[PDB]
Design a protein around this ligand. Structure first.
Ligand SMILES: *[C@@H]1O[C@H](CO)[C@@H](O[C@@H]2O[C@H](CO)[C@@H](O[C@@H]3O[C@H](CO)[C@@H](O)[C@H](O)[C@@H]3O)[C@H](O)[C@H]2NC(C)=O)[C@H](O)[C@H]1NC(C)=O
Lengths: 198, 212, 212, 220, 213
């Protein structure tokens, strides 16, 4: 008798978090068949850094984290380690020594709305870039230049967030894409998340 | 334009029973469906958002499920405070939000006899030229009741106006009022005015009267 | 407190290029960067806002990037309509308004190279009798549209009196320019020859005139 | 803590115009989508329109039955939403609610209306205003006494008992429309018959459209 | 849809003043901050001044601080720029733009304001005498101010082969340009190549015949 990991709760969720407020669930004390995901064909992106999907079912880790969020199709490339741009710098930043995988798929038929889906938001302004796995959920008025803002929107003072406004008629590069990031942390503690081959 | 359809239009269940309300859209709305509760005289209250998510503070008895074009609101154990009209609403078309026609949820309970009172017309109203006799039907269920006005011994026909309160949120009973409107002279001409009520909770047709 | 851009850029149609823009941490590092396209004779059009965000209507071949103290505009699939001047802009933590770079003229080599036509005119006798002298040297039908003109009196480089326009596109989409040498009638007659040397893409054509 | 209070509205002749305002407090009005939702007497909820927040363009969208006649505007300076109604028809007679959605946190669900106002009644008809006449329904184990709000127009009227001290057993009936064209209702309350000697019961009737406030004492 | 129409531009002398105007259309003018950006001839862009939606906040660059005054009138969807103590360096095409997400998203086509300190002066026109079977002649119009001029040949009779080059701005503060006609060596036909230059601001009309030397 084996305890299987709750992946469907993460992959098959009614709502995904906005990338700026990305969601993280801990995976522990279960058995995960990773080859099921790698060979699912439903994922437009499946890139693993620090390991190979072929050996995932034979490896064990002490902790597994699933980070989920929605971004544009043309922003999925920024999830890889050592990239830059609006998402990598201001919203979600993977470390350069990242050990895990990056899984995305098109969600135009789930997260798009006629007239725009403004529920999915991204951070547009930030003075310093995000550090790996950092989460900034602030909504303070961003100040550009020297003029103080007094907490009001104006000529040099802007709201830090902006909606995606996903529409089903948008081009594929702009369509919503659900992303799931699996991180494989391994310490000198007992490993609790394993593949079927161990 | 997405149109929302609800069924049934009205229902009546006992306390502690499970109730189901369905919602249909003319086209798929994905998961952008919300459920609202509107008690009489109050503003709508959000119960379920995103098809299945329960709003904070809403009792766990309420749940929702569905996707695409078909959805369902469930109340696991109907309570007397749950009397209200329930609406589903779609937000898949952001520029054109539409609601469903609504479903009236009512409470089935044990028969309750009415406490009937009869009120003679005001003396100040008699000065103004009109006469109103109010007959109270208090805390009764079912709502079906028969109120017959009989001035002296003749049954009246077209001078009575009835109004019934909504089901009470605590005891799930109705209350009815029947007003007989006549001119001062017609009221001064006759003597005994009787309000005859017959109801399932009444062993006999109870008749309250006043003489003047 | 100043943004610096490379003054020019060149590419064949279809190629991709990258326009650079350097500064400080107080401007590009601690404030968002914008990019603007401007074809001569028009208003600047917004291409990139918030470092790497494209406003509505901007094709995806225009890309934005940013490092610690520098920003970059990438233009994939260079097209004829991309021959324009591109300005970076950002804010500085010490100023209330945004700063602009010097610009960067991107030339899309749509047509094959065309050597310039040079026509040097001596001063007119009427102008000489008016105690003035002007050497006019007209450059026409050259592509790309960039030239350097050098006047010489008996080989020695001239030191004053040279006024030259900027290149300007003609009806055939080839470019033209003109240069003027303002001399005194005494200086015009005190030399054996004056030469107008027009350089284009390394090679230079020369026309000379002499007093008669 | 978040609250919305509609103001304005009342009786208005067909073709007239009204401007409904609703006041926001307890939340950042500038960050919230604002909507209007109306409900005619016993007819169900209907979406009227909505104005997004400044950050998402501040654009408006209106339902078809009101497009071109109603104008929605916002004034973030004063935390107030406005609905400018014109060419009013008798079909526009309804209670108008102002409302915002579930996006004041990290999880955003626009057009899920969790905060609603109390709603202001807007009546559209050719009839004129008339103040009500209050008559006592004097009582005789359990006795019944009440007040009769006779002739008034338009809706609504406010009735309480001892300024909110008496609520148990209070039954304020829905207004009947008389053959006169004006409404009438009654508010009754059951009390222990021993209460008539020790306690005094008076009804507080208020008809804002007619600017009439009456406190009538129902004596045994 | 969104449109920004600018006006109120012209020529002025140092120390003078001029009020620029820009009418907005196609968007809610009260909700968006506006800005002025000028472009010197042949040079780059420079932010001039900014205004808040209601006018409660003004922003000025140090190069125009204390002299220029920005303002708007929401009762007419119009933004104004009041320029005082004009300098020669203030010469530029002043653009009208709407502020959006830290950038100027929509721009106006611009109005030209000129600080010269020069007199309206008529031009001096001299001929350019000619000499592979193609002859080139023309006439030089010198030291004229301000723009523009209109040069034609034989009162618009000859159109083919006429190239009028853009004018050069000299340190004189005066303009100069040249027009040339390239005809084949069959030049005896139009025996009189007359160049007609018109400077209306000067109302100076001067005709000059260019005879081959
Ligand atoms: C999220 O939901 C989807 C379905 O909505 C889940 O997909 C299912 O994936 C399994 C794994 O491959 C499929 O099973 C297979 O069936 C085929 C025949 O169809 C068989 O040849 C294979 O050997 C395998 O048994 C299944 O068909 C597919 N669909 C359904 C409805 O189950 C997906 O697994 C869910 N995500 C997670 C993380 O659980």
């Amino acid at each position: 008798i084996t305890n299987l990991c709750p992946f469907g709760e993460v992959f098959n969720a009614t709502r995904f978090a906005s990338v700026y407020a990305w969601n993280r669930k801990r995976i522990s004390n279960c058995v995960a068949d990773y080859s099921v995901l790698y060979n699912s064909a439903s994922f437009s992106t499946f890139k693993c850094y620090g390991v190979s999907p072929t050996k995932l079912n034979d490896l064990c880790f002490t902790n597994v984290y699933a980070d989920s969020f929605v971004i544009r199709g043309d922003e999925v490339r920024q999830i890889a380690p050592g990239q830059t741009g609006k998402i990598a710098d201001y919203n979600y930043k993977l470390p350069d020594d990242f050990t895990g995988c990056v899984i995305a798929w098109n969600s135009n038929n789930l997260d798009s709305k006629v007239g725009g889906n403004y529920n999915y938001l991204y951070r547009l302004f930030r003075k310093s870039n995000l550090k790996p796995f950092e989460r900034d959920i602030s909504t303070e008025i961003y100040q550009a230049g020297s003029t103080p803002c007094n907490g009001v929107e104006g000529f040099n003072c802007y709201f830090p967030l902006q909606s995606y406004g996903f529409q089903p008629t948008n081009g594929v590069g702009y369509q919503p894409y659900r992303v799931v990031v699996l991180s494989f942390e391994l310490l000198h503690a007992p490993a609790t998340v394993c593949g079927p081959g161990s | 334009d997405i149109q929302m359809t609800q069924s049934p239009s009205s229902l009546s269940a006992s306390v502690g029973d499970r109730v189901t309300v369905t919602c249909r859209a003319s086209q798929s709305i994905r998961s952008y469906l919300n459920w609202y509760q509107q008690k009489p005289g109050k503003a709508p209250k959000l119960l379920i958002y995103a098809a299945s998510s329960l709003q904070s503070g809403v009792p766990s008895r309420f749940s929702g499920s569905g996707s695409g074009t078909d959805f369902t609101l469930t109340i696991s154990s109907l309570q007397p405070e749950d009397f209200a009209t329930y609406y589903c609403q779609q937000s898949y078309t952001t520029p054109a939000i539409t609601f469903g026609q609504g479903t009236r949820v009512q409470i089935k309970r044990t028969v309750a006899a009415p406490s009937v009172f009869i009120f003679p017309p005001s003396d100040e109203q008699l000065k103004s030229g009109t006469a109103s006799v109010v007959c109270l039907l208090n805390n009764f269920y079912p709502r079906e009741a028969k109120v017959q006005w009989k001035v002296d011994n003749a049954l009246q026909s077209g001078n009575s106006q009835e109004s019934v309160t909504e089901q009470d949120s605590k005891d799930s009973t109705y209350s009815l009022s029947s007003t007989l409107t006549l001119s001062k002279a017609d009221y001064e001409k006759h003597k005994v005015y009787a309000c005859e009520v017959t109801h399932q909770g009444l062993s006999s047709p109870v008749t309250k009267s006043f003489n003047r | 407190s100043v943004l610096t851009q490379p003054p020019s850029a060149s590419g064949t149609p279809g190629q991709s290029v990258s326009i650079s823009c350097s500064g400080t941490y107080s401007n590009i590092g601690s404030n968002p960067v914008n990019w603007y396209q401007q074809v001569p004779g028009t208003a600047p059009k917004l291409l990139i806002y918030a470092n790497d965000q494209r406003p509505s209507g901007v094709p995806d071949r225009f890309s934005g990037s940013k490092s610690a103290t520098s920003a970059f505009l990438a233009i994939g699939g260079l097209q004829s309509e991309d021959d324009a001047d591109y300005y970076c802009s950002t804010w500085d933590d010490s100023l209330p308004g945004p700063l602009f770079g010097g610009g960067t003229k991107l030339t899309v080599l749509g047509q094959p190279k065309a050597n310039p036509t040079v026509t040097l005119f001596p001063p007119s006798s009427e102008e000489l009798q008016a105690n003035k002298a002007t050497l006019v040297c007209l450059i026409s039908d050259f592509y790309p549209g960039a030239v350097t003109v050098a006047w010489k009196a008996d080989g020695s480089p001239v030191k004053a009196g040279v006024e030259t326009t900027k290149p300007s596109k003609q009806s055939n989409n080839k470019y033209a320019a003109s240069s003027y040498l303002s001399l005194t009638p005494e200086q015009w007659k005190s030399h054996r020859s004056y030469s107008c040397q027009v350089t284009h893409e390394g090679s230079t054509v020369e026309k000379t005139v002499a007093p008669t | 803590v978040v609250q919305l209070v509609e103001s304005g509205g009342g009786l208005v002749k067909p073709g007239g115009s009204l401007r409904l305002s609703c006041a926001a407090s307890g939340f950042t009005f500038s960050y919230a989508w604002m909507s209007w939702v109306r409900q005619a007497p016993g007819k169900g909820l209907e979406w009227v329109g909505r104005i997004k927040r400044k950050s998402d363009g501040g654009t408006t969208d209106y339902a078809a039955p009101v497009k071109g006649r109603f104008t929605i505007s916002r004034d973030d300076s004063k935390n107030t939403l406005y609905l400018q109604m014109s060419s009013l028809k008798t079909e526009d007679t309804a209670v108008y609610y102002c409302t915002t959605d579930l996006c004041r946190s990290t999880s955003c669900e626009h057009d899920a209306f969790d905060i609603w106002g109390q709603g202001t009644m807007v009546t559209v008809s050719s009839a004129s205003t008339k103040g009500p006449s209050v008559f006592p329904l004097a009582p005789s184990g359990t006795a019944a006494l009440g007040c009769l709000v006779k002739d008034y127009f338009p809706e609504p009227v406010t009735v309480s008992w001892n300024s909110g001290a008496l609520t148990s057993g209070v039954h304020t009936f829905p207004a009947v429309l008389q053959s006169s064209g004006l409404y009438s209702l009654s508010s009754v309350v059951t009390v222990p018959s021993s209460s008539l000697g020790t306690q005094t019961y008076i009804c507080n009737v208020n008809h804002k459209p007619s600017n009439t406030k009456v406190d009538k004492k129902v004596e045994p």
